[PDB]
């Protein structure tokens, strides 16, 4: 089981989630149980916290490929959190048993995926972009922003989620962005 | 629906308004409801204020192309406001429903148009006009006046009306001009 | 819509484009329209430029779900451009109207995908590593190349393609592959 | 009265004048009388000068609402003046008497419209931008040209046409279009 | 003119206001004032019958050297509705999707 | 454009905010602001009909010299989903352990 599309819409409206079980022939009996959305402030080391931000039980729907693939498009205003100063943790719980003979380590009932809004970070990095042009000086701000982002990246991909929040709180908690206009705009 | 002629007469007498509905063939059932004149001191973020400077209901007249085109020539002395130190906000309310299939964003029942007297501003700019001739010096006053006016212009055309009043109050509220002579003059 | 794969083939002979329309229940009416290829010389902000490198119309290939997925393998040598030192810009357009329940912002008819050949960068990194093996000193040109690549990546991800063209032409134009 | 359009045609061959009388209920008796064209050499304060560039009488064209709207397309090469470096002054007059309920100040029988060719300014801006592309430095001549244009605009809008002529002759006279 | 009178009156009132606040004004500007009202009385008197339009052009262009020269004299403002680039309010109204032998048509 | 308007408005608001906090801003940057809104009014007016696509390329590439030049003007952000190296999400699906005369096969 894996993530297909995990992002925050660039208009700062929608936390987009698109999770689907692996297509291998041992993953039939395994389904999707629920999706739990959690933030940096309510994070726990093991499993989702007992006070999550949003819960979504998949089985409360049509009852099989519809279960194996799920998509959410949560409006962030409804969650009452800032799209830019927030780091989301999306836990996906599986429902079923993978049939035997699968290699061990593939039968992980649960996955976690972290989400952040990179648009404010790119705004901050564009300020120091032009330092790359000038020679005779180290682009210190550009290097600093690159390392700041890469730190959260590696701490996420290594599973070191607590230090990931420490870096997030230190660096990017004060990120600002234009809040989405509740009245939708005409365009196409 | 759009503005045809929006100005203050250069004799500092008349706030001239000439609004007419668009001539497209979806704008038949839409008429003009009222015209509300508002100043910088009684401005509200959304819609006209509950204490406007002047209200004019169009339907209190002949009852169709006469409704679709309206013109006002308000004497500013009657409004008891200074023609030069005042910034007017003209709200035009529509009455009707545009027939369907129109592109969205064109069916805006309301428009706003801001009015200022540029003659005192031109008086102030003519003082620094001659700095353009002299070389070896930056025309600092000319540049400053140009930027001051262009600030109100862009803040109006972007919809940033509050900062438009902040700039107006900072820059041009102390504008002076010759008040209109109530006894009309002989000329032609 | 979205890109399945968008790269130059490993043999430096084909420019692979594989486009698909997104699978949501409100894009059934949305299909694919055309593929327009532009280079760093003909690129313009407002959409594909006039006199593009290569125009493709999807109706011609097929004789309805077939038009929701398109794959191409364009021989770059037929395009009369250098596979080493060219930045292809691939626009795609949708001949469709999504449903009325489309969430705000997802009804974007056009997309864009920037393509470069990664082989010359790989060879340059290998040269710099070989120089690093001697006396274990990092050349300043190597850090310069890394940070210039990061600058171009930021320019691409933020949509500022012209300054990316300036950086590419000024820094990475002379490439051997 | 007022001007509908007042420009030099995009091909730099015609000087377009399109005049109309204002639509108020108290200008029914007001018509159009004549069009007089003056240049920066023959311009005078008190109305059109003697020996103007081009005199036009509206009665001749028509054989009453027709005389409330007039349009002209004067071939500039027939006027024996340079379309590049000439500042046309277009006066219009009204052969009419407005009603007695005319508000004070609106009974102005004459109007004036200044015309320049915008092509040379456009080309000059393009040259300065091309110079800006090199080493990203703004020439001082470019800011000078911008502010001199703003000075001439202020001179025109405040009615001080002679100093606008001095600025035009001294600063913008040598133009290529 | 009726305006040279206004400019001269404003200029001298500013002159004597300056001499009231301070006790000095540059004589290089008193010279400009002298020229200004000498021209005003010249053009509003028995010597205005010697003036051609070429002379009028020259007199006006010589007087506008005095315009922003000092604080007493200002640039006059006249009642103007023009500009270097005008607005085009013409409307397009084609006839039943028709065109001429080469181009489009309207009413 | 609708974006040159935003860039110019942001630039001048930052200009007057700086003139409010401090009492000075470099005139080398006021020059950049003058160029910026002169271009904005040039392209949003009656002179936008003289612009070819080559002229558009040149104008845009000359305007991006002003991008990070000063604190008033920033690099604009556009809505982009691309990158220099893309992700390959294609899946491999062979048919009953088959191959063609030279290579493998899928659905």
């Amino acid at each position: 089981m894996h993530f297909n599309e995990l992002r925050i819409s660039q208009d700062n409206r929608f936390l987009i989630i698109d999770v689907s079980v692996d297509n291998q022939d041992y993953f039939e009996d395994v389904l999707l149980d629920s999706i739990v959305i959690d933030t940096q402030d309510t994070f726990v080391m093991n499993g989702p916290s007992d006070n999550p931000l949003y819960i979504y039980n998949v089985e409360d729907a049509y009852d099989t490929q519809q279960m194996k693939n799920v998509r959410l498009e949560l409006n962030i205003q409804d969650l009452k959190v800032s799209p830019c100063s927030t780091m989301f943790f999306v836990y996906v719980k599986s429902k079923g048993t993978p049939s035997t003979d699968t290699p061990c380590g593939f039968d992980k009932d649960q996955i976690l995926g972290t989400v952040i809004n990179l648009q404010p970070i790119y705004k901050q990095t564009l300020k120091y972009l032009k330092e790359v042009e000038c020679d005779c000086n180290i682009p210190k701000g550009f290097i600093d922003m690159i390392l700041k982002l890469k730190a959260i990246e590696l701490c996420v991909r290594t599973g070191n989620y607590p230090q990931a929040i420490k870096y997030w709180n230190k660096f990017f908690i004060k990120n600002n962005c234009k809040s989405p206009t509740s009245n939708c705009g005409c365009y196409g | 629906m759009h503005f045809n002629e929006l100005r203050i007469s250069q004799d500092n007498r008349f706030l001239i308004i000439d609004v007419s509905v668009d001539n497209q063939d979806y704008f038949e059932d839409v008429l003009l409801d009222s015209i509300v004149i508002d100043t910088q001191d009684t401005f509200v973020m959304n819609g006209p204020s509950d204490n406007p400077l002047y209200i004019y209901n169009v339907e209190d007249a002949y009852d169709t192309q006469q409704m679709k085109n309206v013109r006002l020539e308000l004497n500013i002395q009657d409004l008891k406001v200074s023609p030069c130190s005042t910034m007017f906000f003209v709200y035009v309310k529509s009455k009707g429903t545009p027939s369907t299939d129109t592109p969205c964003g064109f069916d805006k029942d309301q428009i706003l148009g801001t009015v200022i007297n540029l003659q005192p501003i031109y008086k102030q700019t003519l003082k620094y006009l001659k700095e353009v001739e002299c070389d070896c010096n930056i025309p600092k006053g000319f540049i400053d006046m140009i930027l001051k006016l262009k600030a109100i212009e862009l803040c109006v055309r972007t919809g940033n009306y509050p900062q438009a009043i902040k700039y107006w109050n900072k820059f041009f509220i102390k504008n002076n001009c010759k008040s209109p002579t109530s006894n009309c003059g002989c000329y032609g | 819509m979205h890109f399945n794969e968008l790269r130059i083939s490993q043999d430096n002979r084909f420019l692979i484009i594989d486009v698909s329309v997104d699978n949501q229940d409100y894009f059934e009416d949305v299909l694919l329209d055309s593929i327009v290829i532009d280079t760093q010389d003909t690129f313009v902000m407002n959409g594909p430029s006039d006199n593009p490198l290569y125009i493709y119309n999807v109706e011609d290939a097929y004789d309805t779900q077939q038009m929701k997925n398109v794959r191409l393998e364009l021989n770059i040598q037929d395009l009369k451009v250098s596979p080493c030192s060219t930045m292809f810009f691939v626009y795609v357009k949708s001949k469709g109207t999504p449903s009325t329940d489309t969430p705000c912002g997802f009804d974007k008819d056009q997309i864009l995908g920037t393509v470069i050949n990664l082989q010359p960068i790989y060879k340059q990194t290998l040269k710099y590593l070989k120089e690093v093996e001697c006396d274990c000193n990092i050349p300043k040109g190597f850090i310069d190349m890394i940070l210039k690549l990061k600058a171009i990546e930021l320019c691409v991800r933020t949509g500022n393609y012209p300054q990316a063209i300036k950086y590419w032409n000024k820094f990475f134009i002379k490439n051997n592959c | 009265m007022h001007f509908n359009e007042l420009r030099i045609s995009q091909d730099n061959r015609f000087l377009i004048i399109d005049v109309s009388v204002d639509n108020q209920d108290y200008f029914e008796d007001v018509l159009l009388d004549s069009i007089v064209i003056d240049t920066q050499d023959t311009f005078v304060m008190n109305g059109p000068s003697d020996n103007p560039l081009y005199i036009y009488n509206v009665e001749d064209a028509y054989d009453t609402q027709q005389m409330k709207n007039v349009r002209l397309e004067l071939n500039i090469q027939d006027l024996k003046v340079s379309p590049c470096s000439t500042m046309f002054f277009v006066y219009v007059k009204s052969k009419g008497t407005p009603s007695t309920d005319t508000p004070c100040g609106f009974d102005k029988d004459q109007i004036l419209g200044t015309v320049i060719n915008l092509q040379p300014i456009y080309k000059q801006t393009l040259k300065y931008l091309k110079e800006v592309e090199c080493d990203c430095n703004i020439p001082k001549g470019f800011i000078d040209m911008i502010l001199k244009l703003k000075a001439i605009e202020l001179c025109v809008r405040t009615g001080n046409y002679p100093q606008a002529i001095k600025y035009w002759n001294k600063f913008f006279i040598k133009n290529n279009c | 003119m009726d305006k040279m009178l206004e400019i001269s009156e404003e200029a001298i009132t500013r002159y004597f206001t300056t001499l009231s606040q301070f006790g000095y004004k540059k004589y290089s500007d008193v010279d400009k004032i002298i020229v200004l009202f000498f021209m005003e009385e010249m053009l509003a008197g028995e010597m205005s019958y010697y003036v051609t339009q070429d002379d009028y052009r020259n007199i006006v262009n010589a007087l506008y050297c005095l315009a922003g020269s000092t604080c007493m004299i200002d640039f006059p403002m006249f009642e103007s509705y023009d500009t270097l680039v005008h607005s085009n309010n013409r409307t397009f109204v084609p006839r039943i999707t028709e065109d001429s032998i080469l181009r489009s048509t309207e009413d | 454009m609708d974006k040159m308007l935003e860039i110019s408005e942001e630039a001048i608001t930052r200009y007057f905010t700086t003139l409010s906090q401090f009492g000075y801003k470099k005139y080398s940057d006021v020059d950049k602001i003058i160029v910026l809104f002169f271009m904005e009014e040039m392209l949003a007016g009656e002179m936008s009909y003289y612009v070819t696509q080559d002229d558009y390329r040149n104008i845009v590439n000359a305007l991006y010299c002003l991008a990070g030049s000063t604190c008033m003007i920033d690099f604009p952000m556009f809505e982009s989903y691309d990158t220099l190296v893309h992700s390959n999400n294609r899946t491999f699906v062979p048919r009953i352990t088959e191959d063609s005369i030279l290579r493998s096969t899928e659905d």
Partner: peptide, 25 residues
């Protein structure tokens, strides 16, 4: 590919230069 009223105004302004009225034949 959405057009605003201003874009249509530019289109009208460009097309008006090419077309002329009945009187102009």
């Amino acid at each position: 590919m959405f057009f605003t009223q201003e874009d249509y105004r530019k289109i009208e302004k460009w097309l008006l230069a090419n077309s002329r009225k009945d009187t102009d034949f």
